[model samples]
Target: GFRILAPTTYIFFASAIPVISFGEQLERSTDGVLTAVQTLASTAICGMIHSLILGVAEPTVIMYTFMFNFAKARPELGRDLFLAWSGWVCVWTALMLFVLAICGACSIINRFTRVAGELFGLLIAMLFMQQAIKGLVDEFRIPERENQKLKEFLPSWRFANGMFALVLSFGLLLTGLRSRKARSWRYGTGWLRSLIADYGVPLMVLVWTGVSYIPIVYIIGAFIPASMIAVLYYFDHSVASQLAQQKEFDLLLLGFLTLMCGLLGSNGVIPQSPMHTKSLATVSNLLQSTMVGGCVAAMPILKTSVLWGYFAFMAIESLPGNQFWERILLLFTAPSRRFKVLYHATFVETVPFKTIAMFTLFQTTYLLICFGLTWIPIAGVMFPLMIMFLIPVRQYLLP
Candidate 1:
């Protein structure tokens, strides 16, 4: 029971940001037409539909999309990414069932070379950090703005002294704690290190919450964006569902239920370890919906620094154990100084140094191109096409 309980519990809290933030943005962009409560409520109600109708006997929850194209449409459509969450999930799911899905294609792509999939994830991880970096900058923007607005918001100091130093240092320390060595169980047997590493974002958010209250979207118009989102949907679900199939579990996730789930405007349902019980999604969503109000109640208490820490946590989380990230990091380190990292076995030992260097250069360029594309309002919709093309490029272009 505890096995099932643990992940469910994690999902309960993990879903917090995705659910609440999107809902809040939706409310703003739609001019209160779709309130945060309504956005969240739809997920809860839709999750229930997934649980009872489409869900296999295994653990399943509405998964977040890593692609983020849905969000790109937010400002244009007045409904943004998280706001676009449900719609894309619904639309994508329908496409999956009606089209008989691309799981077969997904495997075929992987069969020849998984480089595209790797690029897909690497590009996304980079994109996630790009946002986090912006968030970090935004956290520091207050003093600059306040200085201009009031001329002497605080005349006592030449520099904005109040929260600037505190927030910056706190952010630095938070990033430190999030690093691999700090959080790794192999290095630290102590609970303090473990908790801080694992629970740091939430704990810090709460701590900053107590330090005193503070702080602080769109719609589709989702078709063109959803078109790209469908690519991610296929690949993501295909990969995850294959993992599910490895369990040799039962027949519940046979695709029809997911179609039903799509019709309801919820995220795509994919089965995970049965250790994650079916009750997991239901109970998690139950708690999740309630927390929609909980976040509102505590809204005044939360601060920008707290969000900064959370974004950093997410950015840092995507880096570790990912080859794309490791290669990117390798680009900076001198070859002699580099340690025997995990991917080193795969590439560093086998591939020539110049060859590896050229490969990394090529990937960096590809990442920059995708990153640059997101800057173009109209062109961002084509982001996934660029990613999908990597497969053909790898299969046909590369040896």
Candidate 2:
């Protein structure tokens, strides 16, 4: 009863893990200067755009590209790219619409009414925490039932948690606990019993524990500005001075004007470069470390001797070295083949033309709307005008 299902799940999970991990690293390394928050938000917006403008495009293009190349060439793998694509598309589209609806509703409420949006947001957050706790308990304590097909329809616990968070931002509260009867619904003793028995308690405890850590998390989250300030000082003194001396007026002017534009713009772009730069720096450091280690071991004299020796060795080895030595040396050197394999796999799996096109269109539109509404404080009619423009952009122009 072993069957290869779809590759889409693997592709999505693989791609998502890396994206989230890389994005988190980028955010942390930059100390929030390069916030990945926008990227996630942008992805949701783009997903909505893809669904609305080209509902069928995701599965069709994604599957076709995978099947025509990777899967077709490696049929022995027995995975269905099309099924994977279909599943991913459906799930992603649903999530996108959820995000869009919530955001749009919040925006409308803030715009038309006198309600305190911040209070709304806080309330929603509390409700989310409460739900998260409940879900966590269910996950750990609920018994798995073999007859329970309804479980399949239940949203993933993570999705529910996220939705709770998104709504909490709109003003929900969580002061009371659910009844004990409600808590008992999670546990069952049949085949399904094992599902909850094995997992529910840990999840419940984790959620409750995480709730206690919220204040600390929030405090650290606020320190993003301080981190950005520190980076600004370093970058302004180091790179900015060098550029200023070189009379790079355009670059300097752009930087100066963008900074003046506000913290959002400056933090969004300037410090963003360091994320990619740091990855390059890490590789450079690795190379330097290896070379220095080998030098200290082999030469152990003048520093220049190590450098010269490395070059000399390279030149000599460039010709006919022992086949065994060459093969052995390859292991010590960069495993370029692994990098190439990863690169090709990622490209084939993630970045199709239609996906890029949809993302670009959606991002451009979002930016336009955000920029347009920036004038709302001064121009009262601006928001209405933007809504009108958005209607056409979403409905007619994009498709």
Candidate 3:
């Protein structure tokens, strides 16, 4: 008996952007930039995988998060709001994604330089860093519901959780940096090098997951782990595709699949282009690890839908706390490893930097405003607003 039941099979069918663009990422045409072959490959991969994940599981996930939202709103067993509305919400989300694609809305920041790719990527990176910090910081917050109005600028030092959070954060960061540099020391420590090479950032995450069990184990048993994983790990699909110049046909595939997820009212799924050059440098480094087993095992105890609940919601909330002034730095600094590719610029240096900066600043405002709206019930409404306004607004503000 295979786990190949209807629901499971349906689940398998719906994957995301990560699987979609994989074909193109491995291509060597157009010096692996924009090419007919890469486009076709990406389209083919996306059609099958993205359609499955977005179409099947995502809508249901969306339904659950709305469960959280409704619960927060009602302060009771409000299963009433959880079903038909969220399903329609997914329908709308999918329709909008497809409509934009059908309209041939964006060819990407295609006209911009590689820096645009990197700029998008840096914001995504900040999104991850912020989530990790916010997760730890939340551990320190005062617990009384009436007391949420009281902001504790600092977590209680009496609790060891805050200090432990700092340690785990640095441990993982240092491990990742050291892992990336493993090649330099590979000769002397072949086996050690091989472990780091294959296991990669995913392994570091797994290790920290283990290490972190000591202090925040109780809280981790709750919700943040899953949400943190959702926020941090699920973006390579979009990034890799773009670096492979997987633009045109990808829009076609992404839209079709997005419609499916929306129709189902699935929550968070699909990975998209975020970390660009790094995506190309070592996809062997890419790790598809979802710790949902724990979530399911603890199903009876599980609660709290978590920081805005996936995609535009999770990212808009987390990425902005670092503030706009800091993100401007994310605009300027390209990852040095990615610079090898950046060295071969399609846009002259002046244009790439200038073009990416304009786009970055414009979206920074759009996202920050969206971030502020999370307080409202329709805070979830920001998801639709961000997508529809994304291009039309950009076209007006800068050009």
Candidate 4:
């Protein structure tokens, strides 16, 4: 009961927030062609199509999942990514249709190892969180010329929206941690206590946080970057769907919805990252899509600090149990005290710390390279392809 309710509500906010945030940026960039209503309209429509195809399959089962992780990079970097959202839309639509028509879904599936997938997903998550924080910092930057007054003592000290964002970011993270840890804490009365413990995260999330277009030569040229974008989506979709191996979606249906949505001049949906609670995607997505008006109303209530802070929390939450970051952190701990680290206490105990250390450095080097590539013009779009390239490297280049 609570399990269903909790995920249903959590995904609504998670899905809606990004749509609204990115939609606004796109509206502004596109001279209002991609306003929130239009963006949400397209989302709601495709979301319903997504529901129909899948629903036409329990817990009220739906056809597929949809979310905006990859497209988040586009609104801010649209000029570099594509000339126009409209042009880019047509290009992406046709691209998917062509690929699916030619090979069907099975042909595209590359069974990259789970370890590599986790690493790539982790890098993208980290980037998004950093982006959210960067957005918040941008919101807080002071235009004050009065900085001259503090020049002698503290030249860099400005009056502090950055610190405010940091404080809130920490509080938001702690809030999630506490709620998940609520099993042992005494906060509510007896009957309510059980309710709070199981439902705490969704309740707390309920208490929290919460996006675009394009052009043509622009549409034609979009093929290059869009292909790179497709590479990212393919690997991301493959990795995510692979994680839930036995019950993946029909690739044809997935491509069909995306092609339709892109043709409507909106951002297309992609497979949900395994980061979200899986089964709830269809219902949560349907619920979010149906409540278009509610999101519009709720939109104003979201604050920049909370948005970024919540993003930071989400990224951190996923890290603890994962082998990638756990090993990365061990590099910082003293070798003698390494055994005391949490991950090491589990089955990972058999692996030597030195091997973990070397692996961490290797991945870190690649992380840096991938991140560095994002700074280059047009080349940044290749980030996903680069991440996909890691699979071959891991398979053939590494020992």
Candidate 5:
């Protein structure tokens, strides 16, 4: 019962972000939010993508840092390690937050600027888009997933189910974009048009599910669209937290909950998208009722395809809204921004460029080190120590 309801919880997740993101108490938004989003999305999706393309079979996970962990360990223990990692993370996260809260460190966000949010979001968005692009190209590199194949040295064109994928995906995107524009411009029944566009995400999901028999499509294309879902997942919370001037208490709860869920062999929440929270709030209220044993029953469902279906329905119907991500989209798309949206980011005046630079570089290196440590096997147990270093690194480097 809650299996259905669990994804609905995401609606709460989705709703919370917008109120948080583009907010006033809203005293803060974006930088940490973007980092939160990027970390959560990449952790889960990247592993799944690796599994699909490389046959890795990961869980509903988070954080790319664990990629090496999953790649090396068996999956269930990997789940055990994930739970441990988050506990360690909760310590690192909460300790840092506790200190920040005590120091009134919320202003540290100020160390970042609009440019910080832009770059982090840009980093996330580009990585997401690039992942999707890579998903499309990934099949060509794999011998088994393609309908038509050529030598590795050939031009990149592998036309198969993706031809249908293209028509459906493009149509949905245009449909969504058109509606987004219409509502923004006050076109015909603008609200209704926006409602129509809103279905694009869910509809896009339905199309792919219909093609479920095509393992190749999923193997190749799942990451293509899932990356966008990751964007919503990332976008869901940051803007709202920034908008609301979220206090340390909320962050502590997140750390606690991540620990709880990890212990449960399940993935926990992030600040979900405004779209997810919004739709989830509406839908859950519609579906709400305490189902006896719903919680206990939910675990079996998690292991089933039903959860995937539940998430699919949720992802597509919800994405879109709030100018936070939309603005970043412009930062990437608009010629005036020159779409220099790559990591070629120059430092902004807000923070010491060295600080932000070191942070970005360190996090990049951190993921690499996590992966590198995997070959040792036992590093999985000790990996959490790395979590402790994050603060030392941040404190020593960031001002």
Candidate 6:
């Protein structure tokens, strides 16, 4: 869904409006010296690229690299023995194969079938949805029974039979349809809805309010200097001092810096050439460069400023002469630590393996069934509904 729909939504609505609005606002505010559109656009593009590709991927790769280094440097940490190392590798490999197959098949089939190929693509999508729903049901209903005898026999057979039935059902439905003429967009509604509710809506709101208002205030108050310093010291020291010094002006500055960071993270330049030119290579290079640069830039900043402030706050709070500023700093930076803990725990507990596997299985099944049933058009509606229901189910309904 992100691969397909996110860019469309951003381009159609989010991308243009903020720039135009902010550009107007900034131009007026800065007496036309700062062409809001131009300044924001340039900054936005840079930030967008940095955030999406650099912010996410770079950090991920860096953390992986760092973990490996730590494991090598200190054997007692046992970081090298994580289950996710193998499990996530398999999951990623599977996804890569799936994408490659889809692309290759599309390219080959498009030449012969043309119109029919488009319909087939839709058909495959619907089939994927059907499989997804079935998988979800299987996940929720099946108990992890410890009966060795039953586990070795009944569960495996039941799972295989269930999967067979699902595939057969989808095949029958796909072949049963006489005309591809009913080419309405009724398929994959559930998946689309999931994307919107889970990712799209939140991301939009974040870009709008969080990205816009907060960042402006931060920039205006020049809070980036201290915040940047704090971030630099975060790993080594605590943010207690920085937090203590928080004020209205500081909050504004923080917000603005955040906005700039967001913009920098998401932007990337792709070649708009007709000759099938350097677009792919250019994008790959750009992504690689951005990722490396971001990590290199962040390491020092995080280590010195963010880390120092964090540890300093913790140490100060344990003392008798506990300063209010230190306490405030700790409170402000607490979430950062919590986030890291949660993130690291997932890596330790093999959560990514379970998550990626289940997600792939569920979405694939859902797509398959939706295709066979001619429920393609209703996907936009169903997708979000399923996600809305599933999120709560995952959170509260499950054990």
Instruction: Name the better of 2 and 3 by lDDT.
Output: 3
Report the C-alpha lDDT of model 6 over 252-276, residue by residue, as the tens digit.
1222333343233211111101111
Give the local distance difference test score of model 4.
Answer: 0.49
Please, what is the whole-model Cα lDDT of each candidate in the order they appear? 0.47, 0.28, 0.37, 0.49, 0.33, 0.30
Worst 10 residues of 1 by lDDT: 53-62
Worst 10 residues of 2 by lDDT: 50-59
Best by lDDT: 4
> Candidate 1: which stretches are off by over 4 Å?
1-3, 18-43, 52-97, 100-113, 137-198, 212-223, 243-303, 338-343, 352-357
lDDT of 4 at 66: 8
Cα RMSDs, all models: 7.8, 29.7, 14.2, 8.8, 14.3, 28.7
lDDT tens digits, residue span 1-399, model 1: 575445545454455544444454343334444455554554455454434111211011112222233343445432343443554555644554446444444444343225655566565556545544555454344445334655445552444433533464356446545533456656666757755664454555566655535520222354444455455555554544444344444122324544443444333333222223444246444443345345544443442434544544554555664676777777776766564453355465556664545566666777788778866655565666776676456556554
Cα error of candidate 5 at position 320, Å: 12
Q: Between candidates 2 and 4, which one is better according to lDDT?
A: 4
**Model 2 regions lying over 4 Å from their true place:** 1-5, 42-44, 47-399
lDDT of 1: 0.47
Residue 142 in model 3: lDDT: 26
TM-score against native, each model: 0.64, 0.16, 0.47, 0.69, 0.42, 0.18
| Residues 50-166, model 5: lDDT tens digits | 210100011222232333243226434333244344344434433333343323423334423232333233333333333334333433344333333546324433555354334
Q: Give the per-residue lDDT digits (tens) of candidate 2, residues 29-69.
A: 33343333322322222222221010111112212222223
Compared with the true structure, model 3 gives a TM-score of 0.47
Lowest summed lDDT across 10 adjacent residues in model 4 is found at 57-66
